[PDB]
Paper text:
Further, cytochrome bc1 expression is markedly increased in encysted EGS bradyzoites suggesting cytochrome bc1 might be a viable drug target for this life stage. This mitochondrial membrane bound protein complex cytochome bc1, part of the electron transport chain responsible for generating ubiquinone for pyrimidine biosynthesis in Plasmodium, is the molecular target of the naphthoquinone, atovaquone2728293031323334353637383940414243444546474849505152. We present new 4-(1H)-quinolone scaffolds that target the Qi site of cytochrome bc1 in apicomplexan parasites. Our lead 5,6,7,8-tetrahydroquinolin-4-one compound, MJM170, is highly effective against apicomplexan parasites and has substantially enhanced solubility compared with other reported quinolones due to its’ new scaffold. Another critical aspect of inhibitor design for this system is minimizing the inhibition of mammalian cytochrome bc1, which shares ~40% sequence identity to the T. gondii ortholog within the Q substrate sites.
MJM170 was co-crystallized with bovine cytochrome bc1 (Supplement A: Box with co-crystallography data) and the resulting good quality electron density maps allowed for unambiguous placement of MJM170 within the Qi site. The planar region of the quinolone group is held between heme bH and Phe220 and the additional ring further extends into the hydrophobic cavity at the apex of the binding site towards Pro24 and Ile27. The carbonyl group of the compound is surrounded by Ser35, Asp228 and the carbonyl of Trp31, while it’s amine moiety lies between His201 and Ser205. The diphenyl ether group extends outwards towards the hydrophobic residues Ile39 and Ile42 and forms a stacking interaction with Phe18. The co-crystal structure of MJM170 in complex with bovine cytochrome bc1 reveals a clear binding mode within the Qi site. Co-crystallization validates predictions made with modelling and confirmed using assays with S. cerevesiae mutants. Yeast strains with point mutations in the cytochrome b gene that substitute methionine by glutamine (M221Q) or phenylalanine (M221F) at position 221 in the Qi site predicted to yield a steric clash upon inhibitor binding were resistant to MJM170. Studies of yeast and malaria mutants, as surrogate assays, and co-crystallography studies with bovine cytochrome bc1 confirm the mechanism of action/target for MJM170. Using homology models of the apicomplexan Qi sites, there are clear differences between the binding sites of the apicomplexan and mammalian orthologs which can be used to fine-tune the selectivity of our scaffold towards apicomplexan bc1. The larger binding pocket of the apicomplexan versus the mammalian bc1 may provide a way forward to increase selectivity.
Author numbering:
A (entry chain F): 12 to 110
B (entry chain O): 17 to 439
C (entry chain K): 15 to 36
D (entry chain W): 2 to 60
E (entry chain N): 2 to 445
F (entry chain V): 49 to 78
G (entry chain R): 1 to 72
């Protein structure tokens, strides 16, 4: 319906110009750190480089060439399924601790 | 006032699963799911996988999280154990009578529907270095690992604890596959105590139906002759010397089992001199030191080992093993009176009745039979089985030891501890 | 639950205090 | 028989919550008691020499 | 049927008493084997500074030939009849017992009566058991678990009978004469101070006939003196710190003064100790364990093991905990442990107390399974409680306990109390007694 | 592990059997 | 042995209320605590009296002086 603005905002956000996916920019906390720790070798070592390259860009005050920009359609939510489980387990521990 | 004893009921499902419940009217319940899964059903590649699986019983399942399993069982005062032999894995839950369905739920979740998460398994890897190192403080344990390793070739030579190189290398996929292959209907057997039969049957039909490759039976306990001698630098010199006994199903097993009690099985009197023990008296007259010797008897559904275990000083081991060996050879040649056997049978059948006295040992015996045969044979018939063993069977068993191929395992300062060929 | 009588007693302790110096 | 000092411990200062309430109230009273006493001692020590003793004189 | 019904339908224990003084008790079942034995109010607390180690020797010499069955005839006869014979010595309770077939009951009761009444005490055999005990005292020296507990007693009950080890000092073992052993026997081993327990498939009437026929030969009162009765032991809040860096792991045992066998509070204290619980490094649950001390100790890997205990005696005891840990983990373990005590004294959730009850509910029913634990329970109960307590009565006292009771009771025995502390091993980190004593109450 | 009395019974009674649990300490029976 | 270790005699250093080794300390315990904790509390009260005065004086110097109050 309004995926457009979701698409406009994505482009307006600008992390895609640095070659970052959405979940590379998530603010770390106890849940995210834990989700990132649970990531398999490939997805961890990839986000490492994506972030390592994006910081190197941010140092030089530049962005990638337009084709190398991350695509709203090809923006994989690699971190979510883990982070959902970590959150759900913490909620369970809290709901059990409630009683 | 004495209460009435009820019959141990028994049902065998069409898919192959063995069920058995005993309505005890007890305050506590005691449920166990016995499975033909263990050290033997590992192979050259996937070793220590039963050991990690034994440890991983509280990890996240498909229906319940690791947190829920631990806290849910503990909140009802219950406890979930796993007891591995070389052949069988016995997942057992214990609790109060009103909290049965809860522990059953977790038991089924652990045994039928585990997830084996990559991070959870990776987190668990160093626990088996601990759990091994804990048990291996008992030098008995390591001598027996070495004995089975040297005695057999492929099947029962698999160590119960994980090989040291495999610590960390066991995968979540290997656990998945090891469960999928072995944790199956024809290989499983659900035992109950302090519980009604219909609910235990209905649960066993509803949840415990899954079947895959393998399908009971098995491979081959290829018996061999070997000696591994681990130089230890220890206080004592622990050693063992065995030969191929009979498998558990036959009357030969009972002859060897009686012969164990004819020889020095294990002490009954606190701080005694081991009076009626044959082996202890044979070695005591020879060498005058602190020692211990006893008759070791292993019997499985495929094969079995019989002989004796010796504990001694550096130099004494040479004399102790020979003198004990010669006392087996003097029985094997035929010096054995009728009262010796009649005492030994009485010791054995008493010891058996005592082993089934506590509900934990009872359940382990009902679960033993549910897998081994697929039936139940009450104590009285086992008493008859023992009493029916002839003296000739005892002399033939003792003779099969001396004549048969030998398997040795020793650890200590072994400078004056003999080889098999030196016997 | 259990810190209600404690926090009330400390609430009293603190109260008289403000009376203590002033 | 409950003793003298134990009776204080048991009900007055076992808890650290009441310990402080005792100290505060005790200090509140102690201040009035001590000042008043030591004032009177100093005033008896120095009798007739202070202003308050010779104030009625010129007033 | 339910748990509450099962408790009520459990076989009721029955007790009879001989004219000469002996109590005779029994628990009937449908099993074929049975345990039968003799429990005695005798041990280290009854011993004195002269004859410390008497109860242990007597236990050592007991199963060696009786006056009518010499050398190892008793040993041969028990072994050949397919049965087990066993013994022990607690500080307050010595006991001999036979595990056997129900069929074998008459002979078992006779051999027990033979062991107790007419013991040989061969002089050549005292000189051998002297060396055996002298070996066994060095065997206990290496066991750090036992050493720290004997030290806990020694410092908790300093200058009293309970401070004494059951085994006794090596000097007493080297110099204990036959005169001391026989006089200790003649005094303490008597009918009104003894109990005959049994459990299994056996008829109470028959046990009473066997006890009447064999045990009624025991004397029934004293010479008008020589009747020792227990003087109460002074508990002293104090510390003992056997510093020894060579040993791998520090063992710490801390405890406050206990209730004594009689006190109803014991139930609430068992619930209390069940909430704090116990841990070992081989446990499965680890980080998700219910008791916070275990959870914290598992996650951070503070200790190898800890166990909360309530050791009970006639009019006192030791309520506290034991832990085994790395030399850099003692302060932390102590801080979490005392933190848990103080917490339980001041704030105790209804849920965790229900868990505490259920753990104890399960503990009672788990423990009384098999004949030997039930025969122990009978023999011990009659010496301590006076009567056998049914599981329904226990359940009534467990169901009685709620959160307020745990707080009122924990705070009574723990809060602002000097604890008896015992440290053995690399204990440089073991907190100062003033700091431990400061931890025995809270900030509040 | 010093005398012959205590040393009795430590010789292997049966094949070792490893038990691990949630609550109970891990044991090695026989 | 380690059973040779008896705890040395503290009868010299003990309080009078715990000298009898046949006597339960629990009856005296509350008194023994109550005595020591009284000393502490009495000290805290005595310091609290002082602290109040010291602070109040410094506060009063910061307040309006005599010569300003005079010519107001
Ligand atoms: C630590 C404190 C030890 C006690 C010190 C003794 C003096 C405490 C005290 O109360 O002294 C009296 C007080 C005034 O009393 P009045 O003249 O009656 O005035 C009206 C009172 N509302 O004067 C003082 O002595 C205060 C001096 C404080 C000295 C301590 C300074 C601390 C330095 C850090």
């Amino acid at each position: 319906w309004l995926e457009g603005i979701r698409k406009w905002y994505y482009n307006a956000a600008g992390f895609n110009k640095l070659g970052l996916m959405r979940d590379d920019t998530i603010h770390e906390n106890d849940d995210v750190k834990e989700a990132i720790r649970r990531l398999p070798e490939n997805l961890y070592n990839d986000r490492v480089f994506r972030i390592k390259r994006a910081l190197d860009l941010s140092m030089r005050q530049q962005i990638l060439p337009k084709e190398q920009w991350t695509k709203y359609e090809e923006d994989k939510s690699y971190l979510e399924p883990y982070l959902k489980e970590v959150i759900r387990e913490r909620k369970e521990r809290e709901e059990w601790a409630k009683k | 006032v004495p209460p009435h004893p009820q019959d141990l009921e028994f049902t065998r499902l069409p898919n192959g699963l063995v069920i058995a419940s005993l309505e005890n009217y007890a305050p506590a319940s005691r449920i166990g799911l016995f499975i033909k899964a263990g050290s033997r059903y590992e192979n050259s590649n996937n070793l220590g996988t039963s050991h990690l699986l034994r440890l991983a019983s509280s990890l996240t399942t498909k229906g319940a999280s690791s947190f829920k399993i631990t806290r849910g069982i503990e909140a009802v005062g219950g406890k979930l154990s796993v007891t591995s032999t070389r052949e069988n894995m016995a997942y057992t839950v214990e609790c109060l009578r009103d909290d049965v369905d809860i522990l059953m739920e977790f038991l089924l979740n652990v045994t039928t529907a585990p997830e084996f998460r990559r991070w959870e398994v990776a987190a668990l890897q160093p626990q088996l270095r601990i759990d091994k190192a804990v048990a291996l403080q008992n030098p008995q344990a390591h001598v027996i690992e070495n004995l089975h390793a040297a005695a057999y070739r492929n099947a029962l030579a698999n160590s119960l604890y994980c090989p040291d190189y495999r610590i960390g290398k066991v995968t979540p996929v290997e656990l998945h596959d090891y469960v999928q292959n072995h944790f199956t209907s024809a290989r499983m057997a659900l035992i109950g105590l302090g519980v009604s039969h219909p609910v235990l049957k209905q649960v066993a039909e509803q949840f415990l139906n899954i079947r895959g490759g393998l399908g009971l039976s098995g491979a081959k306990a290829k018996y061999h002759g070997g000696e591994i001698r681990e130089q230890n630098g220890d206080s004592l010199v622990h050693a063992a010397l065995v030969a191929e006994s009979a498998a558990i199903g036959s009357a030969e097993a009972n002859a060897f089992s009686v012969l164990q009690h004819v020889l020095g099985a294990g002490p009954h009197v606190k701080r005694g001199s081991n009076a009626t023990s044959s082996l202890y008296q044979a070695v005591a007259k020879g060498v005058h030191q602190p020692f211990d010797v006893s008759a070791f008897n292993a019997s499985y559904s495929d094969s079995g080992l019989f002989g004796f275990y010796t504990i001694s000083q550096a130099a004494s081991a040479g004399d102790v093993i020979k003198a004990a060996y010669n006392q087996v050879k003097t029985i094997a040649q035929g010096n054995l009176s009728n009262p010796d056997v009649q005492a030994a049978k009485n010791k054995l059948k008493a010891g058996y009745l005592m082993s089934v006295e506590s509900s934990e040992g009872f359940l382990d015996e009902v679960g033993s039979q549910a897998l081994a045969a697929g039936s139940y044979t009450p104590p009285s018939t086992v008493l008859q089985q023992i009493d029916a063993v002839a003296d000739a069977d005892v002399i033939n068993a003792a003779k099969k030891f001396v004549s048969g191929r030998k398997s040795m395992a020793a650890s200590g300062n072994l400078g004056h501890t003999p080889f098999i060929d030196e016997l | 639950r259990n810190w209600v009588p404690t926090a009330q007693l400390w609430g009293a302790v603190g109260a008289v205090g403000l009376v203590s110096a002033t | 028989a409950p003793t003298l000092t134990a009776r204080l411990y048991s009900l007055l200062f076992r808890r650290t919550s009441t310990f402080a309430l005792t100290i505060v109230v005790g200090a509140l009273f102690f201040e009035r008691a001590f000042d008043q006493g030591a004032d009177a001692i100093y005033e008896h020590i120095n009798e007739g020499k202070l202003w308050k003793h010779i104030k009625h004189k010129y007033e | 049927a339910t748990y509450a019904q099962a408790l009520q339908s459990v076989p009721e224990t029955q007790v009879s008493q001989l004219d000469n003084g002996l109590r005779v008790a029994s628990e009937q079942s449908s099993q074929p084997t049975c345990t039968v034995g003799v429990w005695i109010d005798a041990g280290s607390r009854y011993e004195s500074e002269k004859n410390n180690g008497a109860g242990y020797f007597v236990e050592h010499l007991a199963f060696k030939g009786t006056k009518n069955r010499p050398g190892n005839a008793l040993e041969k006869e028990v072994e050949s009849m397919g049965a087990h014979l066993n013994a022990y010595s607690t500080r307050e309770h010595t006991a001999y017992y036979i595990k056997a077939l129900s069929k074998d009951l008459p002979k078992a009761v006779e051999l027990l009566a033979d062991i107790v009444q007419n013991c040989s005490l061969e002089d050549s055999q005292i000189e051998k058991e002297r060396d055996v005990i002298l070996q066994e005292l060095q065997e206990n020296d290496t066991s750090m678990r036992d050493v720290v507990f004997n030290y806990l007693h020694a410092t908790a009950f300093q200058g009293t009978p309970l401070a004494q080890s059951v085994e006794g000092p090596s000097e007493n073992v080297r110099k204990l004469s036959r005169a001391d052993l026989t006089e200790y026997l003649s005094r303490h081993y008597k009918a009104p101070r003894m109990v005959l327990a049994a459990a299994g498939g056996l008829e109470h009437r028959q046990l009473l006939d066997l006890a009447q026929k064999h045990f009624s030969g025991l004397s029934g009162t004293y010479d008008e003196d020589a009747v020792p009765t227990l003087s109460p032991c002074r508990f002293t809040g104090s510390q003992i710190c056997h510093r020894e860096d060579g040993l791998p792991l520090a063992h710490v045992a801390i405890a406050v003064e206990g209730p004594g066998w009689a006190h109803p509070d014991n139930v609430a204290l068992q619930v209390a100790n069940a909430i704090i619980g116990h841990y070992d490094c081989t446990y499965g649950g680890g980080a998700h364990l219910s008791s916070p001390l275990a959870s914290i100790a598992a996650t951070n890997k503070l200790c190898q093991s800890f166990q909360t205990f309530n050791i009970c005696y006639a009019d006192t005891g030791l309520l506290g905990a034991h832990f085994v840990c790395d030399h850099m983990s003692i302060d932390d373990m102590m801080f979490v442990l005392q933190g848990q005590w103080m917490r339980l004294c001041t704030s105790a959730t209804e849920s965790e107390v229900l868990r505490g009850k259920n753990l104890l509910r399960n503990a009672l029913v788990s423990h009384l399974d098999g004949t030997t634990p039930v025969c122990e329970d009978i023999g011990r109960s009659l010496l301590t409680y006076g009567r056998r307590i049914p599981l329904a009565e226990w359940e009534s006292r467990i169901a009685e306990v709620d959160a307020r009771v745990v707080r009122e009771v924990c705070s009574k025995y723990f809060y602002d109390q000097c604890p008896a502390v015992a440290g053995f091993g690399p204990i440089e980190q073991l907190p100062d007694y003033n700091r431990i004593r400061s931890g025995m109450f809270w900030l509040r | 592990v010093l005398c012959r009395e205590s040393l009795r019974g430590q010789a292997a009674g049966r094949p070792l059997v490893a038990s691990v649990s949630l609550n109970v300490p891990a044991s090695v029976r026989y | 042995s380690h059973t040779d270790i008896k705890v040395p005699d503290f009868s010299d250093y003990r309080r009078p209320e715990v000298l009898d080794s046949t006597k339960s300390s629990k009856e005296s315990s509350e008194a023994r605590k109550g005595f020591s904790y009284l000393v502490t509390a009495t000290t805290t009260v005595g310091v609290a009296y002082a602290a109040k005065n010291v602070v109040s004086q410094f506060v009063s110097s910061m307040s309006a002086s005599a010569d300003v109050l005079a010519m107001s």
